[PDB]
Design a protein around this nucleic acid. Structure first.
Ligand SMILES: Cc1cn([C@H]2C[C@H](O)[C@@H](COP(=O)(O)OP(=O)(O)OP(=O)(O)O)O2)c(=O)[nH]c1=O
Ligand SMILES: [Ca+2]
Ligand SMILES: [Ca+2]
Ligand SMILES: [Ca+2]
Ligand SMILES: [Ca+2]
Ligand SMILES: [Ca+2]
Length: 901
DNA sequence: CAGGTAAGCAGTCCGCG
DNA sequence: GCGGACTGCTTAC
């Protein structure tokens, strides 16, 4: 097999590299890598190296990396550009792996671990590490085993061994329900003292040294805690054994409000799963506890126990250890679903970066562009310092708030990357500028044609047309990967809908799920077999279809995120290729494109409807248009349709056969107007939306920009078994909205869109009457909590104290002088409840850490004093009043003449 | 900690005769 | 009481 790196580090004048050799074995080597950098040279000096602008460069070979670094400094002192990859390990990888890397994940040691630490005096601070580590579960992907290190004797209690047999038993048998599929994979090691546990852990670590190290909060808790605890007991040199090169450093992570410390382990790639999840999942959760996320992702019940965690070990060590093992497994189950590790490996190896650099699109693109340019003996420019400057973004159309019955949407495929490719936007393709007319002049095609030579954006920028820039070239490659994966995602989705239809008529049989590839549209033979299957087999197939869809979604959406990130990287001052002219070329072209095509679509539809000045495009945001199809439906007449699906077909066909060609023609003209390099503005139908045929549903409504809801029947070629609500911006979509309120508002909207005003009124009246019975957590608002200390004036709200911060200050007073009560963590999320006047907490709200029950000390008082009236008014009635006035109906029945009977 | 901008709503403070 | 200036938070794209 071809060799591939595992990790790479620079340590002084050495590159330290762990890799897989040609025989599939893991090796390590120290290389005295001599880097090259570059300086401009005279034209009369023959060379093969040119900067991106075609200027000749001489290559400078240094005796060592420190010499190269010093030269860079002196070049700054002189005032001359020092060209080339200043991050020598990326140059090392580029030299050592000069080919498309083909990696084998089965050879990469992926470690997933979690630690337990009993603490009687509050949260165990990793930088202090003053409490014993009393459990470690460490799963190794190569052995496929969970290694359990269990401390039996501690100053906080001596316990009996954990029993695998009890762990396996059902909760109803007194057991812990550790999943049977992992029972045989547990290797259990009890220890009579902490020193021996830790020494054995380090010996194990030496044998099975993680390449990728993950787990939940490992970078902020487990890793610094283990490191610091070993450091406290044995000294620094022993703690550094966590690094295969015996090198670590404390890294200080700074944000706007403060800073925190992590431990960089040289020769390890830490991918904390919480951070993977936040970057790649495209969720925003009310809580990020593993219990909360596990429940969300896997629908597994919360790990139940009595008393505080600080007493769990001594009260029930059996459960304590089982829960540590289950916690490690949960992360593996989440990754089995979401495939974020797989994604990280793919993207890292593609770019030729340390795997942990996938978190940084700037680093990712710097490396991709460097490798691409190097292939042609081109030399990258030095990074420079830039002041942060604002610049313009997208256009958003102001919609008229209203109900909208029939709606068809269209948007650009991969909008910003397509603009980059079409216009040819790149650092080295800038050809010059032209005199700009007001945007509306280009939108209305009255402005002078910008250029007859170069490819243009309406911000005034011109680009060469003779060759592709490195940015278009490289963005195209990742776009193509994205498209492939989206294909699989959509096929899995469509396949899922076939199974849901079939589930309306399950056969009374004992049979098996079909062995099929869900990434490809079911053949007719598969469809026939499915129509004969039992519910059990069909549900298992649906589960598999949906897992395939999730897998496809991860692959596609994060590749989209990467290419979109290049468009923004051009507008980040730390990017080597930062240029506001290019960042603005993209966004301004986007503004023009949307408003251009809005005009073209209106003109086209006014023409086919025999009207003038009518607005068919009701809304648009960035790269999308929403078209009212009422008149199209009305031209055939609602009476002519057999069922809902009939008019959906008709609109689908109308969009595909009439609208899309018209849209394409309009964009080709725009491309020609801008003299662009390649027509790549492809605006395909997204949604077909309307009420169910013969119902009183309103179909859809807008309240304002970025706030709307649609009853969708077909999304990007997926025809749903059941209509699906596309809701954007409204309170149902906000993590700040109470969970039960999100649910109720969603049901109000469903009724509005599908059934009508009377159905909405029936549900409101019931919700208003019954909501007081809702569990307090389900009706609590949620907010991130920043700057708690800034607004704290002697434990009371300072001036301008935000509402959620006030709640926290209230909480802090109520738990005063408790090491045991859970503290609110600066920067994390809290639940927030309003309090009735005259309450014992002495303020109008209380907040406590999100994802948790409020401490028993105050729980009963909170329940007693909760202000249900304020809560309902603010989270439910106010937003619902917004939805219904926009939609022009009433959530409460108004009086009529009939009442007199 | 980790590409970008546009823009919504909650809440504070305070004016508005 | 609602709006504007402002802070804070959150989402759409
Ligand atoms: C979703 C999203 C969009 N955008 C910008 C860049 C996008 O190209 C543009 C339009 O967004 P989208 O229409 O959401 O995405 P897209 O056009 O890139 O891809 P698709 O083919 O799935 O439609 O808005 C971001 O900058 N960040 C984001 O997270
Ligand atoms: Ca724990
Ligand atoms: Ca799009
Ligand atoms: Ca599309
Ligand atoms: Ca059947
Ligand atoms: Ca869009």
């Amino acid at each position: 097999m071809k060799e591939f790196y595992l990790t790479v580090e620079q340590i002084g004048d050495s590159i330290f590299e762990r890799y897989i050799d040609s025989n599939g074995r893991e090796r390590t080597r120290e290389v005295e890598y001599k880097p090259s950098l570059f300086a401009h040279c005279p034209e009369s000096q023959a060379t093969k190296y040119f900067d991106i602008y075609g200027k000749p460069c001489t290559r400078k070979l240094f005796a060592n990396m420190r010499d190269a670094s010093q030269w860079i400094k002196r070049m700054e002192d002189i005032g001359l550009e020092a060209l080339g990859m200043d991050d020598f390990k990326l140059a090392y990888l580029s030299d050592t792996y000069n080919y498309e890397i083909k990696y084998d994940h089965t050879k990469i040691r992926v470690a997933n671990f979690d630690i337990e630490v009993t603490s009687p005096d509050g949260f165990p601070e990793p930088s202090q590490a003053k409490h014993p580590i009393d459990a470690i579960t460490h799963y190794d992907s190569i052995d496929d085993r969970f290694y359990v290190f269990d401390l039996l004797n501690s100053p906080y209690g001596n316990v009996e061994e954990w029993s695998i047999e009890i762990a396996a038993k059902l909760q109803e048998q007194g057991g812990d329900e550790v999943p049977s599929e992992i029972i045989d994979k547990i290797i259990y090691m009890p220890f009579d003292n902490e020193k021996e546990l830790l020494m054995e852990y380090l010996n194990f670590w030496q044998q099975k040294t993680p390449v990728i190290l993950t787990g939940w909060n490992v970078e902020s808790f487990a890793i610094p805690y283990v490191y610091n605890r070993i450091k406290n007991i044995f000294g620094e040199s022993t703690a550094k054994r966590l690094s295969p090169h015996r090198k670590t450093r404390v890294k200080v992570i700074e944000n706007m409000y403060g800073s925190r410390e992590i431990i960089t382990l040289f020769g390890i790639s830490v991918l904390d799963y919480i951070d993977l999840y936040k970057k790649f999942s495209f969720t925003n959760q009310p809580s990020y506890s593993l219990d909360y996320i596990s429940e969300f992702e896997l629908n597994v019940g919360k790990l139940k126990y009595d008393g505080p965690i600080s007493k769990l070990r001594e009260s029930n060590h059996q459960r304590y250890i089982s829960y540590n093992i289950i916690a490690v497994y949960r992360v593996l189950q989440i990754d089995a679903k979401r495939q974020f590790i797989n994604l990280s490996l793919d993207m890292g190896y593609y770019a030729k970066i340390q795997i942990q650099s996938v978190f940084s699109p700037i680093k990712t693109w710097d490396a991709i562009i460097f490798n691409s340019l190097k292939e042609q003996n081109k030399v990258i420019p030095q990074g420079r310092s830039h002041p942060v400057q604002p610049y313009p973004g997208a256009f958003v159309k102001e919609p008229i708030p209203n109900r909208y019955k029939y709606v068809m949407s269209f948007d650009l495929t991969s909008a910003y990357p397509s603009i980059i490719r079409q216009v040819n936007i790149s650092p080295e393709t800038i050809a010059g500028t032209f005199k700009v007319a007001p945007l509306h002049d280009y939108i209305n095609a009255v402005a002078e044609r910008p250029s007859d030579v170069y490819s243009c954006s309406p911000n005034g920028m011109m680009y060469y047309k003779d060759r592709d820039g490195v940015v278009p070239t490289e963005i195209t490659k990742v776009f193509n990967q994205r498209k492939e994966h989206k294909g699989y995602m959509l096929a899995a989705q469509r396949n899922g809908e076939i199974i849901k239809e079939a589930l309306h008529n399950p056969n009374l049989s004992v049979d098996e799920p079909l062995d099929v590839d869900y990434r490809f549209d079911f053949s007719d033979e598969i469809k026939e077999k499915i129509k004969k299957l039992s519910a059990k087999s069909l549900n298992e197939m649906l589960f598999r279809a949906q897992r395939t869809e999730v897998a496809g979604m991860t692959a596609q959406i994060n590749r989209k995120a990467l290419i979109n990130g290049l468009a923004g990287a051009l507008g980040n001052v730390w990017f080597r290729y930062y240029d506001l002219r290019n960042a603005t070329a993209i966004t301004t072209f986007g503004q023009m494109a949307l408003q251009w095509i809005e005009r073209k679509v209106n003109e086209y539809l006014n023409e086919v409807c025999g009207t003038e000045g009518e607005a068919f495009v009701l809304y648009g945001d960035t790269d999308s248009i929403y078209v009212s199809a009422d008149k199209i439906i009305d031209k055939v007449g609602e009476s002519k349709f057999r069922d809902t699906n009939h008019w959906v077909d008709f609109l689908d066909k109308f969009a595909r056969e009439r609208m899309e060609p018209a849209i394409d023609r309009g964009f080709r003209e725009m491309c020609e107007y801008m003299n662009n390099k390649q027509h790549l503005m492809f605006m395909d139908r997204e949604a077909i939306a309307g009420p169910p045929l013969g119902s009183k549903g309103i179909g859809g409504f807008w309240t304002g920009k970025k706030r709307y809801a649609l009853n969708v029947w077909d999304m990007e070629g997926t025809r749903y078994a059941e209509p699906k609500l596309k809701i954007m911006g409204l309170e149902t979509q906000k993590s700040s909205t109470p969970k039960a309120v999100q649910k109720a508002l969603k049901e109000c909207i469903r009724r509005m869109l599908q059934e009508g005003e009377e159905s909405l009124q029936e549900y409101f009246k019931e919700f208003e009457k019954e909501f007081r019975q809702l569990n307090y957590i389900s009706i609590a608002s949620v907010s991130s909590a920043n700057n708690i200390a800034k607004y704290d004036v002697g434990g009371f709200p300072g001036p301008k104290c935000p509402f959620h911060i006030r709640g926290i200050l209230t909480y802090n007073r109520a738990i005063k002088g408790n090491i045991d009560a859970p503290q609110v963590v600066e920067g994390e999320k809290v639940y927030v409840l309003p309090l009735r006047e005259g309450n014992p907490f002495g303020d109008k709200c209380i907040a406590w850490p999100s994802g948790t029950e409020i401490t028993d000390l105050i729980k009963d008082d909170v329940l007693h004093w909760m202000d249900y009236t304020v809560l309902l008014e603010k989270t439910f009635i106010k937003p619902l009043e917004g939805f219904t006035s926009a939609a022009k109906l009433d959530y409460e029945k108004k009086a009529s003449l009939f009442d007199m009977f």
